[PDB]
Design a protein around this ligand. Structure first.
Ligand SMILES: [Fe+3]
Ligand SMILES: [Fe+3]
Ligand SMILES: [Fe+3]
Ligand SMILES: [Fe+3]
Ligand SMILES: [Fe+3]
Ligand SMILES: [Fe+3]
Ligand SMILES: [Fe+3]
Lengths: 289, 289, 289, 289, 289, 289, 289
């Protein structure tokens, strides 16, 4: 039912650091502000990522997109049936988010979620990257993906698949030591191999990282050098086993939250079949202190 | 309902002969062992063919793949309704087969079948053939196909189509003498013209042969020379009438069980129409003593 | 429900004339006989057109193909419900027609129809034309089409669409004089613009003509010269308004029954929309005495 | 050296007949006049065919195009060396023809030829056909071709190949009776199989016909019906043996001069090899009284 | 011999106006400075356009590129033979221009020209436009083109074609009033229809305008709005008759010098043929006060 | 200089055997006769292979094609300079061979060669195979190739390359026993890897075999079965190391002369580089008694 | 004149280390031995890289390939004219190298060079990598490239371009410190951006490294992990500025000699233009201790 991940809002301790990070390093286009939130663009949408001041230094909310008004009412019906509490966004919130309608709720573990429809687009103000990146792969696959940390993956799974409609792509057992392994579950709601992954990681954040997909391999290669100069690289270039995303990781100005910048992943369709992997790295991705 | 044939297990009298056969001749990649079974790879799956010691010198079991956990429960519901006895594989069997879940049963005539989901893949250990073969055509069409010998084709047909969901592609009347003919039934469960064929052959084996599809015609041409040097050729190159597979046959180290190595067959789809053929050979396939 | 027109049987006064006509002129491949009927091939099917001796000098029967055994039973259920009388072909008829099963019936006006499934194919005996023609367009679209003459087009239409499942493509008002016009109805049951057309023509035959589609335009150009030398041309080259078939017409050895040899027609699909035309000729098709 | 045939001028007894013929039937666009010559367009050139009053009722002149000023001087040098008399067109003639420079001469048998360069184009006045024709194939291959009647083909051949640079494509022996045959020589100077053909025909005209190439087969089919309604058809549709032009012929208002309207011919290149044909018709082209 | 136009240097009265113009409006990337000249990029070259202070408010020089050192010596030999005065650029000039070698000269009417080879590229500093433009079409066709004003077009033509190796593409008679027309000559030295055009215009500048080619039509559409907001539009969108460039014109901060921003022109090759046009506009290009 | 191998003439002891062989088995089209020679077609040429009665039971002559009359005179000049004796074919021979001109000579070891130009084509009589073969690959590459047996390969090489213009493709050392090897030299004169190969084989024939190239792999597969039924197979299917021709060999009715029927070889071009191979078989080609 | 780099021979202190390195790490196929040299394959050539015992621990020789025997004689003529000493390889050397002919010489600074023609190929023994690599890009571009260290780049340049025929692609100034830079010259002799580069590096080896090009990016990614496990990585993944090769570097068992494993470089052609770069890295290539 949820069609794609449309936007993300972060609450951070260092807004100037995040602004420079998202523009100069990542390459997003600065798009003014909405309230005390600075807006950033990656394409034709009026905004894709919002950054506001806050002690959380974590993801503040995530916008889940449906294709129309009826679809949003159908989501409200699903929440209602599942017994999930939610509130309809008032006019002010609709204006602030620039959407035609939205339902505000939370996943089982505190992450505020906003199901919305009718987002604002500004084709008369063509996207202009702040750094050398040819463009981002969004469109029907949404803004990208993120790894949601959860204390109970089974509980999280039930909510995301059963209530929100996400579908399991595959699982990767992430070695967390000699005799410790965490089964990460990758979920899709469209062509993107996964829009949200659930993992029971021993981390104090709502998410482990968010990912943006660039158009070319050079986009990623150039990006790595930009973030290396910032001294934020956390991983060498690599390619994932399940989605085949070729990428590198880097720290955001928010401690323990990373960003993944990749290219050329595999996409999913109806014929997709669930599989299991023992490693997240097909090759590369060597961790960097 | 069954999506594709994912794996095969053989119980044989000469394991060293089978190991050399599958690697040096066929070109499969040796992939360690699981219990007393030696594993072999043809692609990204952790294993595709298993070979263990046994007096049977025949196919020990066949793995039938579904796309997810729900699908496996739906298969269990079908078996239940059809009155087909089955057992859920315990943790140890799941570990041994490297699958997330599986149901163990038998076809009407003793062939152990395992319906499973969530197989293991190892992209961090890229497939490397043991002999010059560019690659195998698997993917959604599974590992290949095999001809199941049955005492009663009508009984077998009812089980495979009605209970397992296979669909009849076509029939070939195989001349078994001047006034003797056996109607072989070809069944598909995906794009592969046929994944399983049923034939009432006067042979003491569970199957007449199994087939692997290579990527190029040269793969087959080279393979024929490799198996000819082993003195195992049972047929000259040829092309089948129904699936248009261009191939040759050869003996495996297990008496009366052959292998077919082919290329470029026709694939099936929704618009497929059942037809009848009087010969299995479009051309070639001359039998070789 | 009927999938395509698979074969035609003619009962004629001059078999040697028809044999020469179909082979030397049309280019079909002579394929032996079945009973007192001479068989002719246009592709991989064991036969497509049968010609037997008879005073009728008309179409004796038409084979309507379905994709499988279940589909044939579903047709039997439709006939039953519609109150249409039919008989299951006995073993001998199945053998004679080389089909796995068939129902024998008649359209509202006497044309014997045979709904069948599982036709015989002989890929080991590759099609070889008897005259220079590169090949025929058959496959899923069947053998071609024919215009069925009927005394009551509304009655015929109800039977073919409501009972057999054909779908109206379009209508062409065929000027039959200064103040006389006959509305020809074109029906499809697959990709071929039309497999059967109904027209209330003042002709003593069951059909006005049958059509075969060649692979290239040169096939048609060469064919016209072949039939012109036979002195059988009834129309100059032309292109139809509705299906866009580029063709010419010629007399068969059976008085008042013609053959149409064409190329490159338009095909239909789900999005097709019913339309009306005042002429059958987009250009050409000038009638020739 | 001559690059392509760029234009033709006719001197005719019935200008109104020729105007209607070229526009309503052929489909050329009326483009005003130059002196007492009515101009017609087939593409971006200011004019392609000119028609002026005259008792000749034949081709008055032909424009042979070179790519630049230097090239024209090189042609003048060739004529000079070959001893061929010619005159440089004065300013008035350059203006009348709308060319930057031109040499006026005659072939060995009286046909006035004008070698020119720098023709006028009017892209701001897009070509608009006077009849339903999708467009003409001109460009680098020039306006089309024509068959030049000559009393001595060997003498004509020497001049056109040796002096003007045309190259022999092939020869077709045109049966002119039981024991009479005329060897027609086809010459090219670019991609068009032939731009000029020489034949010793017993006809009182400078040319037997001129040819225009349309973009689609329907263009030709529609054109045939248009000229048939005018009662000018001289040949049924057909396809030539040497250039593979699919076309039909028709009479122009000038007695004994025809027009050929075709499509899809074969083109020539460096690897072309001279061949001989016994017929001009691959198929069709049946002569019509 | 000259391979393409590689760079342009302007001497202007308002550098800050030119900097804003080239970046914010045109979209070029600011690339530091060289001496008192501000550098701008359009691709991988270290610089493409230089702007320095000066009363000229005109083009200061133009860089003509050859492919190697030998080629530059061959140009020196040509100048020498033609009696054209030139000087070899010293080390300092080579450093300032970032080229491996260069000859400094002037065209017959005072425009300083620099023939060079071995330009500097900086792929490690990816091009980043200063305004929304997807990219520019440069590569082998050079930076673009410009219209050189000359008092004597015949004298200019002799120098550019005979000494520098440019080739005439075509001519357009530009109506300069009721009975006044100026024949503009378009010259190419590569795939670009024209790199330099000569016209005897009554203007006090060395050039009438310079042109840049963008990758998409939207690039041009967006650019027009950007320059319209600057109030610099001199022409509405249009398409040229000869090169088929779809573009609009605008004033640069230098009085009487314009810029042309276009897309999708036709390219030239060996088979190109010289032609003449009476208008520069195929459509559009309406002049704007 | 020689452009391609255009035709072959055989002198044989059993003409009826050769006629059946070439038509029923190979698939060539019977094309009447010329003198006491029966003609056979493979495409649009009036004939490609001629068979006449004779005790030789070998190749009687080979036609080497040039593109025009001038080219033939240039060949005559080459023969003259090389001191090679030759005679111009009289009118009768030109008529018999259906060529516009030809020079008759012999290679250094007795094989009569005819260099010709202007061959006859009959597009009005479309090629119709006598057996199921989709078509042959001829065109610019000629009819195919043949292996010429010579007592002195160096002497043969000098003549074919130096006098006739053939170019060495590569060499294959053909093992003729434990310590015996024959270096076969492959020569091309166009795109066909080789048109003529020279080998010092201990065989009493002028040639070891001739080769024809079919359009599809099935053409070859079907052909093998046809020749196997004739009991003429001399080799199993295989693929050559140098030209990559996939084929099989068979005996012609002429003792010690074979035919090769293949598909999909590699073609040569200017960038081709001479190489050496130790085997003729990439795979297959197992000799059959 | 030299067509491509065909092979390399190394003289090393640790042959077992080199054997494991080239097979297990790089992925080359072990191909027996020739004398005391172990041979390795990368494609259809009998060998591409040879490794023999020696204190040099450097490149022992390089094979430069020409297309034929005449071409080799033309090279001998060039050496002769240039006054370069050389010796014709005797039969034994020809046998050892498996070439049809070769000239032995040295570049100006001691690197033994062997110009050869007619190399041996073994298509009957299909290439089989020793490690997971899909294949190498060789063919007309040869085996790859290498950086030749020279004390005098101008002297080296004169020899390689003037005597051997290599052509300068571009130059990269390699920063060798704060005020130290070495101008590396890249030379091509075919489509490969460069086959040999000259640089005045302060290194005691004949070459700095040799490069092999793989078919896919994953080939490189997998290769990096293989060499990292060997602890031989000297550089992180990166992409070069001039040839756009995406690669990583690693140490060979020979101290101070590295290997480069890359993918997807740009290729050169006639239109190539010499340029200059200040960095070798477009991105990545961070040096690793
Ligand atoms: Fe991720
Ligand atoms: Fe099989
Ligand atoms: Fe019809
Ligand atoms: Fe014509
Ligand atoms: Fe312009
Ligand atoms: Fe051969
Ligand atoms: Fe390198």
């Amino acid at each position: 039912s949820i069609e794609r991940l449309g936007y993300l809002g972060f609450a951070v301790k260092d807004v100037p650091a995040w602004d420079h990070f998202l523009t100069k390093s990542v390459g997003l286009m600065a798009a003014g502000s909405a309230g005390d939130a600075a807006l950033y663009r990656a394409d034709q949408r009026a905004w894709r990522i919002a950054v506001q001041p806050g002690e959380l230094d974590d993801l503040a909310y995530a916008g889940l997109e449906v294709d129309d008004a009826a679809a949003l009412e159908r989501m409200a019906d699903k929440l209602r049936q599942a017994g999930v509490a939610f509130t309809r966004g008032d006019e002010a919130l609709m204006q602030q988010r620039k959407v035609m309608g939205l339902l505000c709720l939370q996943d089982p573990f505190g992450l505020p979620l906003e199901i919305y429809y009718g987002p604002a687009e500004i084709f008369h103000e063509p996207f202009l990257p702040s750094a050398p990146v040819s463009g981002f792969v969004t469109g029907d696959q949404g803004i990208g993906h993120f790894v949601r940390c959860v204390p109970d993956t089974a509980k999280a799974m039930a909510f995301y698949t059963e209530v929100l409609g996400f579908v399991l792509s595959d699982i990767i057992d992430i070695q967390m030591g000699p005799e410790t392994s965490v089964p990460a579950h990758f979920l899709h709601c469209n062509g993107r191999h996964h829009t949200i992954a659930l993992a029971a990681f021993p981390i104090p954040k709502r998410i482990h990282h968010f990912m943006l997909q660039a158009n070319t391999i050079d986009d990623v290669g150039y990006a790595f050098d930009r973030l290396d100069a910032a001294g934020r690289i956390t991983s060498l270039l690599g390619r994932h086993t399940n989605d085949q995303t070729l990428s590198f990781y880097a720290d955001t100005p928010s401690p323990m939250i990373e960003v993944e910048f990749g290219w050329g992943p595999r996409t999913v369709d109806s014929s997709w079949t669930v599989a299991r992997h023992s490693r997240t790295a097909m090759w590369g991705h060597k961790s960097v202190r």
